[PDB]
Design a protein around this ligand. Structure first.
Ligand SMILES: Nc1nc2c(ncn2[C@@H]2O[C@@H]3COP(=O)(O)O[C@H]3[C@H]2O)c(=O)[nH]1
Ligand SMILES: Nc1nc2c(ncn2[C@@H]2O[C@@H]3COP(=O)(O)O[C@H]3[C@H]2O)c(=O)[nH]1
Ligand SMILES: Nc1nc2c(ncn2[C@@H]2O[C@@H]3COP(=O)(O)O[C@H]3[C@H]2O)c(=O)[nH]1
Ligand SMILES: Nc1nc2c(ncn2[C@@H]2O[C@@H]3COP(=O)(O)O[C@H]3[C@H]2O)c(=O)[nH]1
Ligand SMILES: *[C@@H]1O[C@H](CO)[C@@H](O)[C@H](O)[C@H]1NC(C)=O
Ligand SMILES: *[C@@H]1O[C@H](CO)[C@@H](O)[C@H](O)[C@H]1NC(C)=O
Ligand SMILES: *[C@@H]1O[C@H](CO)[C@@H](O)[C@H](O)[C@H]1NC(C)=O
Lengths: 437, 452, 435, 444
């Protein structure tokens, strides 16, 4: 246990929130059960007291030695000083619920006997369970599995509370008095949980209620079960839609492109090339267009995620050793990513030159049909459109993509736009172009 | 005399005070019409509540006779013009039909049949107007949508329960297995037993659970299939409305988690470094925790331009008055400046501007903590704080010294600073013809190059 | 005669041909499966079957004499229309649906394309598309309830009346022998099975078990389709209200995050209250994005000539040039008590008032020097060469046609004489206020 | 040889390996649980199990020679393919799906069920290779529901056989009675019980003993989770089935409430309604830019030259000048649809667009009367002299003639600056079109 816990990178703090969640789940799952069922017998009462003391000691350790150690951000910078952390926890709205949970209402154990309705204030510490839910849902890589498991747990908990309320109604009317109430022949929690399932899922088939309390109970339970079943439908639909949102949007765009290409009667080879492009884009990037994601980010994180991805590819070019950092940064923020199918033409001979190609995880060939040099990933081609303004010079070789090349395009207008602002970079680039010529 | 205002709060309190007896009239008019012992036993209570509901209906006709409207932006206060505009509508016909004195017939039958008072349900527009005003007025719109949907299906289930008891009274009590049992038996003859069992029947039918006794005659078969189709459309409405407000109740958290999972999928596909990935994810978690995730222009785009200007004044002028250079500047340029600022948030260790770069932005610090450092890492010469400004000399392009016009300082953020990003072009366009920024920022560039 | 497929005669014929297809589906499966409704209403089904055959051959004639567009122009060559009809599969469905015991008349169900075309034309043409979709989904689920009731009675008649407990009972008993009893009990069994309630008598034989399994799975998918359609219809009904409530709540959460003052947040609340009271939820700046440019220009020039016939000062101008100026004119709405322009403020905006009331005032003193109304105009002396010389407030909720600086720069760098007339009016009012 | 995993041979093999996997799942749980089906048709299950084991051996032999993509191209190195297969978890699943642990027990053949990946890969490749994607996804959901129903039928019959036939009212009845002793009635009553319990209708006999109570609780809960999942999935399928129609009708509805609230006359109202009805009837509603923004410019140009170039090459001005500039121009074109009786160009409008006529007949009208001077058919062009504004002409920067639409034409808009930058690099075509504009405006 250190002086200050960071509460983002601490799996020890996540395990402590797991222990407070297990204490809170013990209290929520076993206060109505011990309150209603006769499972708090004179033999097992020492085990219930042992686990209740373990749960209250976990609550008190949370209130005294972990929650006053939380590193929190105030005024931009983080706070490490321990008395300021203690003051921030004492002036919080977590502490009112924690001190509202930890009052010894178990001093009424000697006044009105043993009753687990006096421990019902321990069900006020829901904020530690929700903090554990957010922490596990934000450290897991597949959060839809935990959201499905948590909705299943909420459904089983509502059925557990309904089984406890049904056994209370059975013991209030009299066990075995009418035909609606619990008869009392098998496992009491199992038959009451079966009644809770068959009522709150609105299945029916149970005996019909006889007197007015039973009709009111069955009415309110079926009415709340309609809304629980509707909320379960909506929550499973929500986790289905949030789990496959990217793949469903990609499949929708691929289906719209296929529907357009079949509406306008586009030939088989062009339709196969578009479908092969879509298949390789999903198998490579797992997204449709990465600029649609990247242009929602701020400029400095766009610059960081551009420099960390593309700087080894740019600096491994031996022609870019004399350039400057700001021009390379504006380059990396103005590099557009394309993709070329095998056998495609990136630079046809004699055409107008307008793009600078940084090949990134591909393999292209230069050409007639004879190969001269097979350019691997990281290399460059397109230095003849570095100098030409307007028409100027043309492409001097047929450049073809051997594999699924993923070029990085730099337009000639943007390259000349940044180059006329940095004449030192223009000088070294024109001298390397001159020794190429 | 006095004219109420349909945007005020006296009108909303009258919408509450008139959406009470409309709801009473719907509920207890169908129940008193169909049950016939609830009407006979509590007759003084229903005469008292009928007097109160018709007094409130007369006062609602009087208030709709004096509710102003908007023509040419001004609320009309001429009572004859308000009365004429009210009398040339259909709501006046609905209120006049909803106050037809059929209580003469209600007395002629003998105050036992409230079927002649069924025209009092014609003021449903006040109930719908109150639910619309509370839906756009209250702070909990999803909790109010649950309250309104539960209220609507409780109206429907109650009306169906009274309809089933009326059909059972028309067929005959206790003749078949489907109808309500024999009301001379003392177990089934209590009024609470009648209403609670009919409500149980109608919930079991209209929610398509079906544990009720099956029909015998053809009228019962037809009523049960009509009731089951109404119930399957009601169950579809319940499921769709609850799923729609589950998608509404966490739409912001859903798109936030979608943005985090999209950027995390991009960072795990490109396989960037773990410190950069943790920096971006902690950046997004800080923007979630500090309630600043949706951009300011995208929030205030539904507002008009002068309301955006007043919001920008009342948010950013308390920060922009803590500066030392815009004291000798005009209030109009202060308003235009807070219209121009776009607030961005940086991370600890993030460089704002490196040394030897060119400037295209100016930053105004607002609840942050920065430090101008050397090239060796962190070496805090001046620790900047709230209210101050930096990044200012390399956008004016003033002449006369050896530094020219490039970023001559390395500046990092110590904590999660929240700067005010001000570009070169929008500042120099907002204060092109007005020389205050030129002279004051030339003085500030003069003292920066005096430090040079 | 050549019928236009977008006219009103074509929609009246789509109604007149959607009548007998909706007769044919319903009552042909009911007659064929019940065999007493056929046998005790024989003259009525003779009349209605002859009328449905007459309307079917009239629909073959009308689809023979309706026209399709080539190169944007409607063909009226009847031989070309007949060959274009003959090359399609709808003609094959019509001649299969007119091939001369209702089990031999079950080719009359093949003209469902006219019913689907009627439903799509009503969905495009009616004013209440949500009410029409409610009615259309209720009609579809009633067709499936009815067809499954007839299928259940056919399976019961094939197995035996009253042999098992699952089947329809013995029709020799005068209680289960009535035709109304037969139909409403088959409909009640169909409703209980397709809505998955299951209050029916349980199956006994293997064909009864298999039919109830297939019927319950079909009813589960029908329930899922009903739930999905009503949920999509509810979301598309209140999507505009939900989008503006999301914008209202994002405004409120941004205000409570920045801790803005109480007077400004209740002013924003009052603005949203005015917006929802006077139904100005949708904004023109996003409405006129998705229009084609010609349709964007027609409604704009319509409403702007309608409001420009109220102003008589700005008339000495070229026709299409004033037209494009009031095309690029743009509306904003001001709150009451709001200063349009202050004393010490430099303008970049011109205004045209429609349905508002703006009064000019002095420095911090409410007094009406001259009040501007519908048909007035202002905002012109500090834009063509540089500071507003009159405090102007909004008395009520006014609606002003704003104007960018670059519109008057475009009407200045190309066309001098109309703006010289405008500047002469501006100079005369300038000399009038302070020569 | 190397099987390409994107070819058609790999999809034929995915069909031929997702047939015995689905057979193995379905009939292996049925043969394990019912045991009259296993005991009677022993020759049929011998033939089908030998065929499924032969197809599993050939599946391992094909997966040992399926290529992958390194540096964007296929690798044909067979030893590299074998080691890249060998260091995976699919090798462990495909070897554990082939160990011959066994004619008396199909329960020692439950390791054949481990090859779920081939069935899921066949479903994925069919969903991305079919033309009816929502129909195949509804078929996939129905197939998953039927497998869950069938497995629950077999599980209920195994639980009935373990508890005892006909000892309770909940279990399957007494197997020695000749009514219930038939295998067809066994399977169809177990399917009926499983369908009712998993769809949560619950009109079957209630449980008696505590293990029956626990199994019916667990099975109702598994059923409510799986069927809330498929209700939400069919709802999302319906939303994706009519998202396009919903967006079209949303545009229509919003503009119809706008026309009701905009005090607009019935003429412009029926004009807007007939234009949207024409858009629906001619199925050209969606924007090509919006639907192919994410495609690269090479494939957008291939689509554009496979739709519009074979209707654009019937011109006398740019027919063999530059194929690359024609590619750039059909990339930069933007189509619009004009109503009949609508003006494209007026006397005095600022000319910033050029128009190419495609599927439409337009007519040059005069200033006062409706005079058909000459009808321009499709493949013609106008709006060029005013966006040039060249010296030696009248040079007023207005449009020198009126253009009006006779029918529902589809003009290709092309901006002034766009044409200038497209003809900037190679200006010989610009000089040629300048010459044509000069002669037209000088002998107008
Ligand atoms: N012609 C040619 N270009 C090469 C060669 N190696 C790399 N490149 C680059 O490939 C190019 C393809 O496009 P460019 O004509 O624009 O210019 C050419 C060069 O920059 C080579 O051996 N020949
Ligand atoms: N060089 C420098 N800049 C300072 C100092 N104090 C504040 N600043 C701002 O820090 C800056 C960092 O970026 P700029 O070069 O753009 O411009 C510089 C100044 O505006 C200081 O002491 N030196
Ligand atoms: N000064 C002045 N402006 C008027 C008058 N009537 C309308 N206006 C407009 O009110 C204005 C307020 O702003 P401006 O100075 O920009 O320009 C002025 C005019 O366009 C009037 O009588 N005097
Ligand atoms: N003036 C004119 N334009 C024509 C004629 N035939 C086709 N056009 C096109 O019609 C035009 C209308 O718009 P523009 O002025 O832009 O340019 C003109 C020409 O491109 C003709 O006979 N005269
Ligand atoms: C109801 O009960 C009374 C008294 O028990 C009896 O006279 C009457 O016939 C009963 N009604 C019916 C319909 O049986
Ligand atoms: C139906 O009833 C008649 C007379 O009641 C009887 O003769 C016949 O056998 C019955 N049919 C069946 C299938 O029981
Ligand atoms: C099943 O039937 C046989 C003969 O019909 C009988 O001997 C046996 O006891 C029955 N089993 C049960 C569990 O009833």
């Amino acid at each position: 246990l250190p002086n200050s816990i960071d509460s983002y990178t601490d799996r020890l703090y996540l395990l402590w929130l797991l222990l407070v969640t297990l204490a809170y789940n013990w209290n929520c799952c076993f206060i109505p059960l011990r309150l209603v069922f006769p499972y708090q017998t004179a033999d097992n009462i020492h085990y219930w007291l042992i686990a209740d003391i373990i749960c209250d000691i976990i609550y008190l350790y949370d209130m005294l030695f972990i929650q006053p150690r939380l590193q929190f951000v105030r005024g931009g910078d983080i706070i490490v000083d321990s008395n300021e952390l203690r003051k921030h926890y004492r002036t919080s709205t977590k502490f009112q619920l924690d001190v509202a949970s930890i009052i010894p209402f178990d001093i009424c154990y000697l006044f009105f006997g043993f009753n687990p309705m006096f421990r019902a204030n321990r069900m006020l510490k829901y904020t530690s369970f929700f903090e554990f839910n957010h922490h596990l849902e934000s450290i897991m890589d597949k959060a839809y599995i935990y959201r499905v498991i948590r909705t299943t747990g909420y459904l089983l908990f509502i059925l557990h509370i309904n089984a406890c309320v049904y056994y209370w109604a059975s013991n209030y009317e009299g066990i075995g008095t009418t035909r609606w109430v619990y008869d009392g022949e098998g496992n009491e929690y199992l038959r009451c949980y079966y009644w809770a399932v068959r009522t709150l899922i609105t299945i029916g088939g149970l005996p019909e209620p006889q007197t007015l309390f039973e009709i009111v109970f069955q009415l309110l339970n079926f009415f709340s079960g309609v809304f629980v079943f509707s909320s379960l439908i909506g929550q499973m639909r929500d986790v289905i839609g949030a789990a496959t949102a990217n793949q469903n949007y990609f499949r929708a765009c691929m289906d719209d492109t296929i529907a357009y290409m079949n509406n306008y009667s586009i030939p088989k080879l062009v339709q196969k090339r578009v479908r092969t492009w879509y298949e390789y884009t999903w198998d490579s990037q797992r997204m449709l267009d990465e600029s649609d994601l990247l242009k929602t980010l701020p400029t400095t994180v766009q610059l960081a995620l551009a420099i960390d991805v593309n700087f080894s590819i740019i600096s491994k070019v031996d022609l870019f050793k004399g350039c400057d950092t700001q021009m390379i940064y504006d380059m990396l923020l103005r590099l557009k990513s394309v993709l070329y199918l095998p056998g495609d033409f990136v630079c046809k001979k004699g055409e107008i030159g307008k793009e600078m190609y940084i090949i990134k995880h591909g393999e292209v060939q230069v050409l007639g049909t004879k190969v001269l040099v097979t350019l691997k990933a990281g290399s460059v081609f397109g230095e003849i459109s570095l100098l030409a303004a307007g028409g100027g010079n043309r492409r001097t070789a047929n450049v073809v993509a051997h594999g699924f090349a993923n070029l990085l395009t730099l337009d000639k207008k943007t390259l000349q736009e940044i180059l006329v602002h940095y004449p030192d970079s223009e000088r070294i680039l024109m001298k390397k172009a001159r020794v190429l010529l | 005399a006095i004219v109420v205002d349909p945007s005020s709060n006296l009108y909303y309190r009258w919408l509450t005070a008139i959406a009470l007896p409309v709801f009473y009239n719907w509920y207890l008019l169908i129940c008193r019409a169909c049950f016939d012992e609830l009407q006979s036993e509590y007759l003084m209570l229903w005469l008292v509540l009928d007097y109160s509901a018709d007094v409130l209906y007369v006062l609602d006709v009087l208030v709709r006779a004096r509710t102003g409207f908007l023509e040419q932006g001004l609320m009309v206060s001429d009572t004859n013009r308000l009365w004429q505009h009210y009398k040339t509508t259909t709501q006046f016909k609905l209120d006049v039909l909803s106050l037809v004195p059929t209580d003469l017939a209600y007395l002629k039958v003998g105050t036992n049949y409230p079927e002649v008072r069924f025209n009092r349900l014609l003021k449903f527009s006040r109930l719908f107007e109150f639910f619309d005003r509370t839906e756009t007025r209250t702070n909990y719109p999803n909790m109010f949508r649950i309250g309104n949907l539960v209220l609507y299906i409780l109206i429907i289930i109650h009306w169906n329960a009274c309809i089933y008891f009326a059909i059972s009274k028309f067929i005959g009590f206790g003749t078949d297995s489907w109808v309500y049992p024999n009301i001379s038996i003392p177990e089934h003859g209590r009024l609470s037993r009648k209403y609670i069992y009919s409500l149980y029947w109608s919930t079991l039918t209209l929610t398509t659970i079906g544990e009720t006794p099956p029909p015998v005659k053809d009228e019962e078969y037809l009523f049960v299939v009509v009731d089951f189709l109404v119930g399957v459309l009601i169950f579809a409405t319940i499921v769709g409305n609850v799923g729609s407000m589950i998608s509404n109740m966490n739409a912001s958290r859903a798109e936030f988690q979608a943005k985090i999972d999209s950027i995390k999928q991009y960072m795990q596909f490109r396989k960037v470094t773990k410190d950069l990935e943790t920096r971006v994810i902690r950046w997004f978690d800080y923007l979630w925790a500090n309630k600043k995730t949706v951009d300011e222009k995208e929030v205030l785009k539904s507002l008009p331009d002068k309301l955006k200007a007043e919001i920008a004044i009342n948010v950013h002028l308390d920060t922009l008055k803590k500066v030392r250079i815009f004291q000798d500047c005009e209030a109009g340029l202060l308003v235009e400046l807070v219209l121009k600022l776009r607030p961005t948030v940086f991370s600890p260790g993030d460089y704002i501007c490196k040394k030897g770069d060119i400037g295209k932005e100016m930053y105004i610090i607002n609840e942050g903590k920065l430090a101008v450092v050397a090239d060796d890492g962190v070496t805090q010469f001046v620790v900047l704080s709230d209210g101050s400004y930096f990044g200012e000399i390399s956008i004016l392009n003033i002449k006369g010294s050896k530094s020219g016009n490039r970023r001559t300082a390395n500046i990092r953020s110590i904590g999660y600073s929240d700067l005010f990003c001000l570009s070169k072009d929008d500042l120099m366009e907002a204060l092109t013809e007005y020389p205050e920024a030129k002279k004051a920022l030339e003085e500030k560039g003069r003292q920066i190059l005096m430090k040079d």
